Design a protein around this ligand. Structure first.
Ligand SMILES: C[C@@H]1Cc2c(Cl)cc(C(=O)N[C@@H](Cc3ccccc3)C(=O)O)c(O)c2C(=O)O1
Ligand SMILES: C[C@@H]1Cc2c(Cl)cc(C(=O)N[C@@H](Cc3ccccc3)C(=O)O)c(O)c2C(=O)O1
Ligand SMILES: C[C@@H]1Cc2c(Cl)cc(C(=O)N[C@@H](Cc3ccccc3)C(=O)O)c(O)c2C(=O)O1
Ligand SMILES: C[C@@H]1Cc2c(Cl)cc(C(=O)N[C@@H](Cc3ccccc3)C(=O)O)c(O)c2C(=O)O1
Ligand SMILES: [Zn+2]
Ligand SMILES: [Zn+2]
Ligand SMILES: [Zn+2]
Ligand SMILES: [Zn+2]
Ligand SMILES: [Zn+2]
Ligand SMILES: [Zn+2]
Ligand SMILES: [Zn+2]
Lengths: 399, 399, 399, 136
């Protein structure tokens, strides 16, 4: 039981910064909210709900050696790095995240929930689902010896080529303890493959995946760069799109008609564009794709916001360094999105995307996830980089 | 050739207790029934047809170590326990049973039929059919090493994900010598999985299973806890439902329209509810499911009987201790079902569910399966716990 | 606590039948022995210690279909037969046995010790150790397809070809829970191989097996028909020889010098000799060997007894029908061995062979294993076929 | 490093299905039964980045096996392990409860003994003569 005394409170639902309030926390939930027991002196700060990042990869981080480490290291080696990744993410103000790829994240989520290590609340997708040769194919770029030794991937490994295989892949993700489903509708930038935006799913396969996920209470997030794959994913019935780099007017119209969410991930685009200029950082099959695709993300976000598409917060922090997720707010504001809208996209709209109703706002009965900063983020978005108070489930991790 | 002199005889077909009769048994069948050679003095007892339990698991029994014994013991070790299980079941008055899961039961049936060991007449299902990650998936809860060593289960192992796979699974059950088919339409309580009532079969897969079973002369029994899976199983065309914990008015209407049988298994619900309170008895992933689902079985049975659904006798004695199946009668009567109806549900309606016509009543030409108790079970249902005479196929096992 | 009143008591250690005595049993051991509480009336019987059979195969029985059942049945099917085998063996007066081959016997021993089924105390050897193509090779007679599918047997399967392999085979028998070691030094009669008496072990391999067994507290029993293999086994340091059909004067001299035990197993020889005359009972590769070797067992036993070799009791009841082990006494007496010596060879000398000191005689502090028969076995050996009292560990199984 | 069925055998207590699926352990898995296998086991420990060698000379308490103190190594196998470790700059520590296994480990040339529960006067004399360390 603790009472927090804030000088200003950000109303996520209304998008307005109110005056002094007092928040009483008991049993890990907000019990009372008074306008006007242990106590924490925050009267010179602005209190906001904890942020949610809807696209992270906590099991990895980009580096010059990332394309040769997979053949020499084991996942146990990556867990010890994920410890620090998760701690740095939590201490920056993000009390929950949506992990969208990797087999290390479910274990990290279990460890964090058991109290073994520090971190945010993790909604883990597990192994991503692709087609043969797709962006998430685990054996892209292997030589003949290794490929023959391991054999062709199947639904158990996340590679599907028919309706029944998609059904089995979703059921296998459920069997391994996932919270959400991720598919790669088109090609990617960082994969050891040739194409970057070609359609790699059919409409029927997407429909089968979505129906199976509906049976099991899951949501589906689709990775898409090109127009045709994005169109097929939208028609299939996915919940959100991740890298709509080549969104057109027709795609935006379909998104508005169907209510699909859009998660830009501007930070990853900027990072890959910057790293493409360095010689030898990327493999020769990856550099042209990164150079071409990383320079068309901010414009797409600005156009989508202007056209009325629903936008949510996500950074793809497995590409950039973990713990610097808060610069996506600055990028979004510089892209034309108002500061209040950008802050809402990470608190309440993020909770809508996740499908939960016990977080996202400072209201009675909700989880006590509260953060604070000295400045006013609405007046100046640059204040999001100085977070000095973090609370998650009623436990204070930073003061 | 023996003549039995009973003081009272229970007419299963009419549900009434008649007066003194004489039963003459020759060649293992009832030859004559006289109202008014070796002889057995039963003139101070009530003679009834042998009981049938439509849901047992003779190859296993619940215990505190049941979740770690599967990795250290072999089926040969379980057979030596099944010997005593079957003997105790037979001596309690149950001359036939329907085994609904486990690969040890066909062998026990063969041994009992050859006269090697004592037991009831067994209609064995063999391996139960599920989907990937389903309630009957044999590899739920295994770590990565064992899962990779054994590989993903297929139709040969009872795991199906399409119409053709369901066809092959039914044919493989036929190849291994089954008498009936069992599928798990929803999640369960005692499996090492997350869900307990979500739908795990599609209507088309159920239809394929039922059609294939029809080609081979089989009946299909469906395990179902949730509403949607139960609805899909009923629409597919199964013969009976096993744990309709969350039956609603629409489900009952469909059951009445289609003529589906309902087997409550109240004993297992009570047992799991009682054991959930003990700390450490169940794994942490099983305890909440048991606590939530075991407390809503008697009410469902009472509602189903009130609404006119057809009810048959079954206990799920693999959960509770074998040889105490007769307490299901007391539970049924305490649930509002009349004693005569409860006794009929185990003799004639059970024979209807099984699909046979040579047992279930004391009539000329039928199998000589006769039991007797000192009291009158109709007047007092508690008399079913004192069975002192058992005869099966004309052979006396208890006097 | 029970008191037994016998009219005559057989002193195993002295080999004499004494007069009336009273035996008091408490906690499963003999507490008092009085010459002159519950009570059992045995005053018209002769009480002897429970018998021990040093060569049985409780997991199998010879029959016309025994050479095609291994490809269609599973060990679980053989366990249900072993139940009756063990019960019949125990009820005939044999309270302990030494099982010398088969993987079903350790499980039967565990089940009997846990009280699940009735039977004698079992000292199980497990898988027998042989060389490639030897008498105990599990893949003798298989076609090319099956042989290629299963691969060549190694030390894990009981087939050894060097010193290190013998060491590993003994350690693997220890790992699987054995009580004694068995090796086949020569060829056999009932195996699907060509030879019947050729040497199949070298002296060094036998020495390695014996040394490894000594490290683990085991005894070694050797199957041997021919002279050279028997000589090699004796020189290696085994504890007993099983079928010394072709024993010579030099072999007997070595046996006397080293103190090796001899177990004739006359019953199996007579059985195979009788069955060889039936057409089609044995495969054509087995019939000549059986006909030639089964007719030279009684003479060998008589010669060995005349020459002063130490003789112990064993029948090989896996060949003959289980539960008729007591005819070996009649055969031994008809072979020239005195009745008292024959009875001693099954009570005290058998305990010496086993390596235990808590059984074999009716003495204070020993296990309460007592049997009784109406007649006097010393005066008439034919009285051993009428055993009406059996007690094991203080529990009465027959009265 | 252990022998078949030894205290450190990774497959002790498994049923037939799992044992058949994984197969019998060899030197790569740390189970040795001869001199050459011990050599290969030490080299495989070096290949996987070890700093010291551990062997189980006798049975243990917490393993899913029957015995607790019986000797599970021969003197020659211990000697081979120690020689191979000497070639690679390693030390050898021996787990031992019973007297005979402890004696064999000391004679083989190990550096320390871990659970000398049943140490006798002769074992202590050998330890003093050879300079072996004792870790209670
Ligand atoms: C293990 C982990 C999994 C993973 C997966 Cl499944 C997918 C991506 C991914 O699709 N990234 C984007 C990165 C990107 C590049 C440019 C513009 C926007 C985003 C891409 O390749 O198109 C991705 O970047 C990662 C990743 O960071 O590594
Ligand atoms: C080997 C054997 C096979 C087996 C199978 Cl296939 C299924 C069940 C089973 O579905 N039991 C029910 C037990 C139960 C629990 C609560 C209320 C009613 C019934 C369940 O888990 O929902 C089940 O209990 C068993 C069992 O007893 O072990
Ligand atoms: C499974 C079981 C194991 C077994 C083993 Cl390991 C060995 C024998 C065996 O060696 N029997 C003897 C039978 C025999 C035949 C003639 C004279 C004496 C004995 C033989 O074949 O020479 C043997 O008969 C048996 C047996 O009965 O089946
Ligand atoms: C994974 C890890 C490895 C391990 C190994 Cl390799 C060996 C032991 C071990 O030998 N422990 C001793 C524990 C013990 C017991 C009684 C007296 C002293 C010590 C034993 O079992 O005899 C041991 O305890 C452990 C252990 O703690 O688990
Ligand atoms: Zn992506
Ligand atoms: Zn991504
Ligand atoms: Zn069920
Ligand atoms: Zn069941
Ligand atoms: Zn033999
Ligand atoms: Zn034998
Ligand atoms: Zn240790």
């Amino acid at each position: 039981p603790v009472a927090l005394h804030c000088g200003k409170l950000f109303d996520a639902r209304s998008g307005r910064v109110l005056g002094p309030h007092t928040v009483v926390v008991r049993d890990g939930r907000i019990d009372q909210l008074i306008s006007g027991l242990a106590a924490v002196d925050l009267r010179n700060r602005t209190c906001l709900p904890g942020w949610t990042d809807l696209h992270v990869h906590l099991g990895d981080e980009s580096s010059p050696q990332s394309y040769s480490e997979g053949f020499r290291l084991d996942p146990i080696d990556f867990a010890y790095r994920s410890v620090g990744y998760a701690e740095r993410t939590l201490l920056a103000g993000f009390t929950s995240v949506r992990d969208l790829g990797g087999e290390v994240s479910p274990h990290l989520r279990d460890a964090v929930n058991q109290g073994l290590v520090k971190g945010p609340r993790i909604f883990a997708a597990g192994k991503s689902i692709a087609t043969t040769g797709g962006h998430a194919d685990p054996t892209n770029g292997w030589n003949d010896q290794l490929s023959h030794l391991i054999g062709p991937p199947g639904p158990t490994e996340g590679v599907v080529n028919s309706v029944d295989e998609a059904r089995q892949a979703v059921r296998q993700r459920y069997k391994d303890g996932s919270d959400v489903i991720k598919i790669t509708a088109t090609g990617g930038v960082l994969s050891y493959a040739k194409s970057g935006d070609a359609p790699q799913f059919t409409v029927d396969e997407v429909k089968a995946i979505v129906d199976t996920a509906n049976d099991y209470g899951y949501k589906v997030a689709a990775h898409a760069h090109g127009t045709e794959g994005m169109k097929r994913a939208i028609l299939g019935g996915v919940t959100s799109i991740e890298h709509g780099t080549y969104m057109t007017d027709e795609v935006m119209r379909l998104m508005k008609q169907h209510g699909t969410w859009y998660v830009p991930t501007i930070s990853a685009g900027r990072f890959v564009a910057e790293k493409a200029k360095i010689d030898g950082y990327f493999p020769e099959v990856v550099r042209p794709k990164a150079a071409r695709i990383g320079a068309q993300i901010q414009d797409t976000a600005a156009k989508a916001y202007r056209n009325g598409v629903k936008i949510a917060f996500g950074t793809n922090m497995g590409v950039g360094p973990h713990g610097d997720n808060a610069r996506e707010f600055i990028y979004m504001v510089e892209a034309g999105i108002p500061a209040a809208t950008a802050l809402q996209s990470a608190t309440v709209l993020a909770a809508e995307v996740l499908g939960v109703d016990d977080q996202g706002a400072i209201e009675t009965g909700k989880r006590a996830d509260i953060i604070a900063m000295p400045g006013d983020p609405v007046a100046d978005i640059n204040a999001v980089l100085n977070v000095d108070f973090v609370m998650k489930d009623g436990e204070i991790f930073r003061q």
